[PDB]
Amino acid sequence: FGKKKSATAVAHVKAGKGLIKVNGSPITLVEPEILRFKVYEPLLLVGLDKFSNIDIRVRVTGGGHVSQVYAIRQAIAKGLVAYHQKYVDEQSKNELKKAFTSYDRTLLIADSRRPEPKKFGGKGARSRFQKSYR
Amino acid sequence: NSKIFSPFRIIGNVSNGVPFATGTLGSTFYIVTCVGKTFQIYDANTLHLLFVSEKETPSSIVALSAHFHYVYAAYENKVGIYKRGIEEHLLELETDANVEHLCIFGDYLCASTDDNSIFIYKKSDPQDKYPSEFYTKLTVTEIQGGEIVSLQHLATYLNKLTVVTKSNVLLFNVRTGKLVFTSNEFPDQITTAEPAPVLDIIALGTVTGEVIMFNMRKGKRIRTIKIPQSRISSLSFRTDGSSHLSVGTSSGDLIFYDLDRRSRIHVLKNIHRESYGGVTQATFLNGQPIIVTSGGDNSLKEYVFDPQPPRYLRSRGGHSQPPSYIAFADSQSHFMLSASKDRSLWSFSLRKDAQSQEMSQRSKFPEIVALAIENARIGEWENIITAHKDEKFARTWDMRNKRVGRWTFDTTDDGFVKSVAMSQCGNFGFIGSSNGSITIYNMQSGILRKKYKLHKRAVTGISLDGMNRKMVSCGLDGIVGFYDFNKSTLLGKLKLDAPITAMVYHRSSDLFALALDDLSIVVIDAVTQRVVRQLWGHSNRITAFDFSPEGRWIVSASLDSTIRTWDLPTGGCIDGIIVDNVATNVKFSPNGDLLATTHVTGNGICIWTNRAQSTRTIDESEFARMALPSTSVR
């Protein structure tokens, strides 16, 4: 349900079991790794109220790599708290939420940044080419 | 005499069992019921409260009759003559006997007494509004007949009063004094009598279920209908074209019989409680297919015949037993929610029309043992929670549709519900268990939100501050629990010296009071989690208590038959009232204007005016011995 700086991650919500697959995989993998956490850290981040739950998982895809990674990010907890009451918490879903966003920036809504704009100049944007007429 | 409270009025009274009267109202009819020492007058076609007698009689009203625009009410050796609830005249019979029966016809007023005398008063001039001059005194000696059961006037019987006794039927000429007729002995005791809509015929009910059509002219039976194993308590003929007869019984049944087809039409089963006399009166309205019924169970019902079995049309009533729990339903002083041991939940209006309505339970639910209501979410979802005797779940109700709600809230620890509460926002319901658990439910979805386990004995009180920050509880273990609502942390515990039986939380001041078995009232600050005051004075078990809206006062009631006012800045009792009828509930109106009390005897709710909206001087035996408000007010 959440897109990230030219990327976009979709949310799956309806109670089930373990193995929450991202794309069509398993937030065990998610191999653009290094910072492979911050993904498993939404679920881990559940460290504030829940321990893992027993629910669902969906696929992302847009822009490029770390973009996507950051997208699947919100994607998750931006879908634990899912309305609710069949998804979030049948009452006071600020349970997670305010907790899963008292140290967040992914589920903590998205960033007002997004690529565009250049210039009749050099590279463009602001970096206008280097000229030194004599 | 009290410095704070002065009696205003009583709410929720409709009928007490005295057979209601019917009179003429322009084109429509009016119904006169008895409330005790007061009568009330309703429209027969709407059941709108038209009048209430402005001044209480010295003793309980025993008999009611209506004649045109005048109401005749019997009590002691007297007959009061009223118009528009206002006494226009008082007849004091020259006797120490009590009036039992009345009959008004022609220029005459006939009032029989419990020594078988019949006092006859007469109009001086036929165009007088009512009889006022004593004319004569008839007597039915035991050889002439038995104990007088009823006085009736048959159509076209000029100057002739029909006096039906337990054993026979007499006919007196009240002008000449002559006993012109006396029937043969009746074998079985006559309990009821009713003029038939045809010449010379009177219907007589017996202790055995027999209705006898008797011809006064020829002095013989014409017809005898048997109602198996019933005791007849009322008779009335339908007069809209259908030759039907209604027979009320002491068991609370109303039987409809076709006189022409000689068959039982129908029977309304248990429309009035048998333990309160069953059907004490049932009357077809003249020219209408409508029958009005009543009993001693504080209800007045109306049944119709559509152009087929009779169909419930409308009714008015209150509790048949004293209210056990009450609450103001709103901040506009519109409704009060009230529960009684008669297993009913009612909403009573505080306004002039005295409207009321029982909460639909669509054999009743067990008696309510705890009640909570919040007006915030009215219409949106359930806003009432009730605990029921020996049940492990609380029920919910909807104030908008005056009906039971969708959810039941289980204790989860196999205990009974002993306390209930609600958030001010109306989002949450709180349930306290006899096993110690506290459960928090979502009023919108019915889902269990949170569960706490601190108490090891019954939780007798629960509440939450207006900002939903801190939750407080009390129990028979003498523990006061303080919890964080947003998390589930135990914020603290207090251990009091006695079992705690009840809690009242004051949301605008964040103080809450507790009633203890040691007869004290403990006041605690929820913010500091400390006891700030302790009130000593009552000599018996505390029944109820409440905060004055400002937070300055606490008013309390007890088995000691007192109602006391406590000033919190000093902790001293600044006013005390001694009642002859123990108060079981005391509640302040949301605005400081009124005080509602419920008592051990009486079906209604007493309203008091807080005329102190005062000194801080202590009291002792300077308490006022005040009587409850008059039923004649408003």
Rounded distance, CA A68 to CA A60, Å?
7
Residue with tokens 């004490």: B280
Rounded distance, CA B588 to CA B555, Å?
9
Decide if B445 and A92 are in contact by the 8 Å CB cutoff.
no
β-bridge partners, B299: B317
Residue with tokens 């029309």: B353
Q: Are strands B70-75 and B254-258 parallel, antiparallel or unpaired?
A: unpaired
Chain A contact for B489 (CB, 8 A cutoff) = no
| Chain A residues whose beta carbon lies within 8 Å of the beta carbon of residue B449 | 90-92
The three-point CA angle B53-B56-B60 to 5° equals: 110
Rounded distance, CA B608 to CA B615, Å?
20
SS (H, E, C) A40-81: HHHHCCCCCCCCCCCCCCCCECCCCHHHHHHHHHHHHHCCCC
Residue with tokens 């009821």: B192
Residues ≥6 apart with Cβ < 8 Å to B249? B209, B227, B230, B231, B232, B233, B255, B278, B279
| Residue B409 DSSP SS3 | strand
Rounded distance, CA B85 to CA B469, Å?
54
Residues ≥6 apart with Cβ < 8 Å to B239? B197, B284, B286, B287
Instruction: Kindly state whether residue A54 falls inside one of the protein's structural domains.
Output: yes
* Largest Cα span, chain A: 73
**Torsions phi, psi of B524, nearest 5?**
-120, 135
CA-to-CA separations, B230 to B194, B208, B396, in angstroms, rounded = 18, 7, 40
Q: Does residue B393 contact residue B350 with C-beta atoms inside 8 Å?
A: no
Rounded distance, CA B500 to CA B479, Å?
8
Q: Does residue B299 contact residue B316 with C-beta atoms inside 8 Å?
A: yes
What is the enclosing helix (H) or strand (E) of B89? strand B86-92
What is the enclosing helix (H) or strand (E) of B494? strand B490-495
Rounded distance, CA B206 to CA B394, Å?
48
Q: Can you give the length of chain A in residues?
A: 134
CA-to-CA separations, B465 to A98, B204, B485, B511, B512, in angstroms, rounded = 21, 65, 10, 9, 10
Which of A49, A89, A92, A96 to mutate to test binding with chain B, by most B CBs within 10 Å of its CB?
A92
CB-based burial label for A115 (10 Å; 0-12, 13-18, 19+): exposed
Range of the domain at A83: 1-120
| Residue B274 DSSP SS3 | helix
| Chain B residues whose beta carbon lies within 8 Å of the beta carbon of residue A92 | 442, 449
| Secondary structure letter of residue B188 according to DSSP | S
Q: Does residue B213 contact residue B219 with C-beta atoms inside 8 Å?
A: no
SS (H, E, C) B355-406: CEEECECCCCCCCEEEEEECCCCCCCCCCEEEEECCCCEEEEEECCCCEEEE
Instruction: Kindly state whether residue A60 falls inside one of the protein's structural domains.
Output: yes
> How many Å is the Cα radius of gyration of chain A?
19
Q: Can you give the length of chain B in residues?
A: 634
Rounded distance, CA B606 to CA A52, Å?
57
| Chain A residues whose beta carbon lies within 8 Å of the beta carbon of residue B442 | 90-92
**Torsions phi, psi of B200, nearest 5?**
70, 0
| Residue B275 DSSP SS3 | helix
CA B188 to chain centre: 35
Instruction: Kindly state whether residue A2 falls inside one of the protein's structural domains.
Output: yes
Rounded distance, CA B316 to CA B302, Å?
9
CA-to-CA separations, B238 to B292, B344, B573, in angstroms, rounded = 11, 33, 61
Q: Does residue A83 contact residue A28 with C-beta atoms inside 8 Å?
A: no
β-bridge partners, B618: none
The three-point CA angle B317-B286-B239 to 5° equals: 120
Decide if B449 and A91 are in contact by the 8 Å CB cutoff.
yes
What domain count does chain A have?
1
| Secondary structure letter of residue B622 according to DSSP | -
CB neighbours of residue B433 within 10 Å: 24
Rounded distance, CA A74 to CA A60, Å?
11
CA-to-CA separations, B397 to A49, B327, B381, B406, in angstroms, rounded = 33, 14, 9, 8
CA-to-CA separations, B520 to A36, B150, B463, B474, in angstroms, rounded = 64, 56, 20, 15
Rounded distance, CA B554 to CA B514, Å?
11
Residues 69-88 of A with CB under 8 A from B: 85
Chain B contact for A90 (CB, 8 A cutoff) = yes
User: What is the CATH number for A47?
Assistant: 3.30.230.10
| Residue B276 DSSP SS3 | helix
Report how this structure was experimentally obtained: cryo-EM
Does a cis peptide bond (omega within 30 degrees of 0) precede residue B144?
Answer: no
Q: For residue B512, which of B605, B593, B419 has the smallest C-alpha distance?
A: B419
| Chain A residues whose beta carbon lies within 8 Å of the beta carbon of residue B444 | 91
SS (H, E, C) B419-442: EEEECCCCCEEEEEECCCEEEEEE
Q: Are strands B63-67 and B49-52 parallel, antiparallel or unpaired?
A: unpaired
Chain A contact for B468 (CB, 8 A cutoff) = no
Chain A contact for B442 (CB, 8 A cutoff) = yes
**What is the structure's resolution, reported in angstroms to one decimal?**
7.3
Rounded distance, CA B109 to CA B89, Å?
13
Residues ≥6 apart with Cβ < 8 Å to A47? none
Chain B contact for A92 (CB, 8 A cutoff) = yes
CA-to-CA separations, A41 to A8, A73, A99, B159, in angstroms, rounded = 18, 8, 13, 103
Q: Does residue B5 contact residue B611 with C-beta atoms inside 8 Å?
A: yes
Q: Does residue B439 contact residue B488 with C-beta atoms inside 8 Å?
A: no
| Secondary structure letter of residue B104 according to DSSP | E
Tokens for B409, please give them.
Answer: 């809230």
What letter represents residue B200's amino acid?
D
CA nearest to A90 within chain B? B447
Dihedral angle, C-alpha B490, B494, B495, B500, nearest 10 °: -90
CA nearest to A98 within chain B? B486
How close is the nearest chain B Cα to the Cα of A90, in Å?
A: 7
Inter-chain Cβ pairs, chain A and chain B, closer than 8 A: 13
DSSP A79-121: TTS-SSSSSS-SS-TTSSTTSTTSS-SSSS---S-------SS
**Residue B369 Rama label (left phi>0; alpha psi -120 to 50; beta):** alpha
Q: Are strands B448-453 and B459-464 parallel, antiparallel or unpaired?
A: unpaired
> How many Å is the Cα radius of gyration of chain B?
29
Q: Are strands B594-599 and B583-588 parallel, antiparallel or unpaired?
A: antiparallel
Residues ≥6 apart with Cβ < 8 Å to B97? B77, B113, B114, B115, B117
| Residue A39 DSSP SS3 | coil
- Dihedral sign from CA coordinates of B267, B268, B269, B272: negative
Q: Does residue A96 contact residue A89 with C-beta atoms inside 8 Å?
A: yes
Q: For residue A71, which of A103, A114, A102, A28 has the smallest C-alpha distance?
A: A114
What letter represents residue B61's amino acid?
I
Instruction: Kindly state whether residue A131 falls inside one of the protein's structural domains.
Output: no
Please tell me the number of Cα atoms within 13 Å of B512 on its side-chain side: 26
Instruction: Kindly state whether residue A69 falls inside one of the protein's structural domains.
Output: yes
Rounded distance, CA B542 to CA B537, Å?
10
Rounded distance, CA B422 to CA B441, Å?
10
Instruction: Kindly state whether residue A30 falls inside one of the protein's structural domains.
Output: yes
Instruction: Kindly state whether residue A31 falls inside one of the protein's structural domains.
Output: yes
CB-based burial label for A103 (10 Å; 0-12, 13-18, 19+): exposed
Instruction: Kindly state whether residue A3 falls inside one of the protein's structural domains.
Output: yes
Rounded distance, CA B44 to CA B38, Å?
19
Rounded distance, CA B94 to CA B76, Å?
11
Residue with tokens 């705690």: B500
